Amino acid sequence: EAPNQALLRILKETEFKKIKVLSSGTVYKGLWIPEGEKVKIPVAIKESPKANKEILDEAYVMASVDNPHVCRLLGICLTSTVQLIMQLMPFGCLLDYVREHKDNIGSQYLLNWCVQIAKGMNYLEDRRLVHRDLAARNVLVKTPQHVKITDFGLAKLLGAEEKEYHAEGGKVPIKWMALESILHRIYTHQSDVWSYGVTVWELMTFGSKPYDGIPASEISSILEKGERLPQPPICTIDVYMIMVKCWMIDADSRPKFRELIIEFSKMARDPQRYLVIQGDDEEDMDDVVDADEYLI
Amino acid sequence: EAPNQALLRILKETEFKKIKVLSSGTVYKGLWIPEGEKVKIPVAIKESPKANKEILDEAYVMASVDNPHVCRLLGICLTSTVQLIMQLMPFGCLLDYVREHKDNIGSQYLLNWCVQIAKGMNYLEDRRLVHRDLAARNVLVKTPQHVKITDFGLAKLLGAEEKEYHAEGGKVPIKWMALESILHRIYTHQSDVWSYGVTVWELMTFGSKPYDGIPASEISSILEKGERLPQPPICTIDVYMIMVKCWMIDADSRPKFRELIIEFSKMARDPQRYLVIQGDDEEDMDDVVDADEYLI
């Protein structure tokens, strides 16, 4: 049980300019010009008071994690409307990218993505943190060969000698959820593995919707009768076998993020043995530095 | 809206002897020998007529509060110069103690202090009283493990169905003050929470001066641009996150004294997970009784 000495940097709204609306709470593309530092950092700005407790728990989790495959918070801004300042991921979330480039994505990208998401999830294991909302919609694309886990709205830090997180009520994404989570609201790192399983499936199917046209009220019944999502077209049995293991009912039986890194990594060395696919800014951009190069 | 049946005990100056000057109005160390009661109570004696209205409003507030973490008035003395008789806090105020023992104070003390000040502030919520001058200089140390809130010069009792106290003019300690208080002279229990935030910061920094070398005229501007006090060295992010919430702009968004007790309490159970610190009378003293044991 070690002390968490992450820094939370508070920013002035004078130091950053919004530019466009990425979404609509309400994310903006922007540029952050710190202190007096001859650098301009491209940022995404997330702009009650239930919403405030929520958004500062998120800030807390996000500040205390540091990994190349995990979303980077640059700071907050304590304006009336609280603001999260994050690294800009120009290519948006992975669900969309995969849908918008369905026709042009190869084995090599797909597998490396499975690797990079496992690396991020393993780091979250190490930090004893449990994401609880892993899905392709919650992976961001920095560049097409570099993705990051994001959206820690539901993330929970595991306590001392505590291995489960019993949830209360609350709206939850059922179709990504493990069975123990859905019946008993228990959440573990293994639980997160189940969702990994479905995230991989979103990717292999180029962005299909798990259990399309089915009731979330049904899902639990299905899972228990022993149904799972079907084998995508693109998938060697080697790959599908890995998803299926993520959906084992005995959570301890599933693979650890550690092993998933190793497995997808071996595969990414000979991508086409494992997936069978047909076809295999602006302004004064001079002091621009990406968040990854802006440390402190 | 219930009747306030506090007692105000009037004392003869014949019943108490001054001994030394604690400060220079003009506080004295002294001993109070009541009635005919075989007890000697160590007291601090605070010795126009603007000053008199002021000092009897203080007496009023102080008489009507009763908590282990709130300064205890023993009575007044209606001599030409009006006198407040209080419990003696031998170790003086907390700002000084923390400065004078900078090098020797641990996580455990610091956190328990944050707890005891929250307990006192919550009691003041219950009694519908608003302190308006909370700061480390206005906490007294009875023993190093037992502190009390003091100085009710500015305290105001909230009325019937009244939730704010609009102030008039008057000199005010800006650097401890909430933003709504400073722009609009509004004061709430939440407002007091902001000051708690800074009181905690005084303690974590071992007695630094908030916003050193800055103009009180600036402060308001800063707070609004979204700057706050920086994260002290000693502080887990867990602790700092709590201060920052106390300085939220939407007062309703800040934590209640209730929650602050709970939070600091959890932390005081494993002090070093949360703070990272290097090094973690006289005469016939026979009928001496401390004020806390002198009831009526």
Is there a domain that residue B93 lies in?
A: yes
Domains in chain A, number: 2
**Taking CB atoms and an 8 Å limit, are A13 and B237 in contact across chains?**
no
Question: What are the C-alpha distances in Å from B134 to residues A196, B65, B146, B152, B175?
Answer: 50, 16, 17, 9, 11
Is there a domain that residue A290 lies in?
A: no
Which token pair is A290? 């990406």
Place of tokens 């180029």: A206
Are both B72 and B116 inside the same structural domain? Answer: no
Residues whose CB falls within 8 Å of the CB of residue A18, separated by 6 or more in sequence, listed in order:
A28, A29, A30, A45
The minimal CB distance from A10 to the residues B226, B238, B270 is found for B226
User: Which residues of A are the active-site residues?
Assistant: 133
Are both A263 and A140 inside the same structural domain? Answer: yes
Burial tier of B10 (Cβ tally within 10 Å: 0-12, 13-18, 19+)? exposed
Is A63 near chain B, with CB under 8 Å? yes
Are both B82 and B100 inside the same structural domain? Answer: no
Chain A residue numbers with beta carbons less than 8 Å from the beta carbon of B225 are 12-14
List the one residue out of A91, A102, A93 whose CA is nearest residue A139.
Answer: A93
List the one residue out of A200, A277, A213 whose CA is nearest residue A244.
Answer: A200
**Taking CB atoms and an 8 Å limit, are A60 and B244 in contact across chains?**
no
| Rounded CA separation A179/A158 (Å) | 20
Chain A residue numbers with beta carbons less than 8 Å from the beta carbon of B270 are 1
**Taking CB atoms and an 8 Å limit, are B227 and A79 in contact across chains?**
no
Q: Which residues of A100-125 are buried (b: 16+ CB within 10 A; e: fewer)?
A: eeeeebebbbbbbbbbbbbbbbbbbb
| Rounded CA separation B238/B276 (Å) | 12
Q: What are phi and psi of B31, to 5 degrees?
A: -135, 135
Are both B21 and B126 inside the same structural domain? Answer: no
List the one residue out of A186, A66, A199, A191 whose CA is nearest residue A138.
Answer: A199
The distance of Cα A11 from the centroid of its chain, to the nearest Å, equals 25
Task: Indicate which CATH number applies to the domain containing B50.
Answer: 3.30.200.20
Is A55 near chain B, with CB under 8 Å? no
B52, B68, B88 - which closes a domain: B88
Q: Are B197 and B243 in contact (CB under 8 A)?
A: yes
Question: What are the C-alpha distances in Å from B164 to residues A22, B60, B158, B180, B191?
Answer: 40, 20, 7, 11, 10
CB atoms within 10 A of CB A220: 15
Is A50 near chain B, with CB under 8 Å? no
Q: What distance in Å separates residue A96's CA from the closest CA in chain B?
A: 34
CB atoms within 10 A of CB B243: 22
The minimal CB distance from B236 to the residues A5, A48, A82 is found for A5
Q: Which residues of B39-52 are buried (b: 16+ CB within 10 A; e: fewer)?
A: ebbbbbbbeeeeee
Are both A58 and A144 inside the same structural domain? Answer: no
Is there a domain that residue A296 lies in?
A: no
| Rounded CA separation B148/B70 (Å) | 5
Is there a domain that residue B288 lies in?
A: no
| Rounded CA separation A82/A84 (Å) | 7
- Closest CA in chain A for residue B224: A79
Q: Are A10 and B228 in contact (CB under 8 A)?
A: yes
Is there a domain that residue A293 lies in?
A: no
Chain A residue numbers with beta carbons less than 8 Å from the beta carbon of B276 are 3, 5
Is A296 near chain B, with CB under 8 Å? no
DSSP per residue, A61-93: HHHT---TTB--EEEEE-SSS-EEEEE--TT-B
Q: Is B48 helix (H, G, I), strand (E, B) or coil?
A: coil
Residues whose CB falls within 8 Å of the CB of residue A243, separated by 6 or more in sequence, listed in order:
A197, A198, A200, A201, A204, A228, A229
Best interface-test mutation with A: which of B211, B239, B249, B259 has the largest number of A CBs within 10 A? B249
A65, A88, A111 - which closes a domain: A88
List the one residue out of B16, B244, B118 whose CA is nearest residue A8.
Answer: B244
- Closest CA in chain B for residue A77: B226
CB atoms within 10 A of CB A253: 9
**Taking CB atoms and an 8 Å limit, are B237 and A53 in contact across chains?**
no
DSSP at A127: T
Q: Are A93 and A144 in contact (CB under 8 A)?
A: no
The minimal CB distance from A79 to the residues B231, B244, B249 is found for B249
A25, A60, A88 - which closes a domain: A88
Would you state the torsion angle of the CA atoms of residues B206, B209, B211, B216, taken in this order, to the nearest 10 degrees?
150
The number of helix segments (H) and strand segments (E) in chain A equals: 9, 9
DSSP H helices in chain A = 50-63, 94-100, 107-126, 179-184, 189-204, 216-225, 237-245, 257-267, 271-274
Q: Are A154 and A97 in contact (CB under 8 A)?
A: no
Are both A73 and A99 inside the same structural domain? Answer: no
Are both A10 and A133 inside the same structural domain? Answer: no
Which token pair is B78? 């209606």
Are both A78 and A94 inside the same structural domain? Answer: no
Experimental approach was X-ray
Query: Kind of pairing, strands B73-77 and B83-87?
Result: antiparallel
Range of the domain at A270: 89-282
| Catalytic option among B57, B133, B284, B287 | B133
**Count, residues in chain A:** 296
Are both A29 and A145 inside the same structural domain? Answer: no
**Taking CB atoms and an 8 Å limit, are A53 and B253 in contact across chains?**
yes
Which token pair is B117? 């000040």
DSSP at A158: P
- Closest CA in chain A for residue B275: A3
Are both A69 and A134 inside the same structural domain? Answer: no
Q: What distance in Å separates residue B241's CA from the closest CA in chain A?
A: 7
Burial tier of A251 (Cβ tally within 10 Å: 0-12, 13-18, 19+)? middle
Is there a domain that residue B296 lies in?
A: no
Task: Indicate which CATH number applies to the domain containing A102.
Answer: 1.10.510.10
Is there a domain that residue A222 lies in?
A: yes
**β partners of residue A70:** A149
Q: What distance in Å separates residue A204's CA from the closest CA in chain B?
A: 39
**β partners of residue B129:** B157
Are both B120 and B263 inside the same structural domain? Answer: yes
| Rounded CA separation A128/B91 (Å) | 43
Is B278 near chain A, with CB under 8 Å? no
Question: What are the C-alpha distances in Å from B165 to residues A213, A219, B179?
Answer: 57, 55, 14
Which resolution in angstroms does this entry have?
Answer: 2.8
CB atoms within 10 A of CB B2: 4
List the one residue out of A74, A69, A64, A32 whose CA is nearest residue A143.
Answer: A69
Are both A73 and A215 inside the same structural domain? Answer: no
Annotated active-site residue B286? The verdict is no
Chain A residue numbers with beta carbons less than 8 Å from the beta carbon of B231 are 7-8
Is there a domain that residue A287 lies in?
A: no
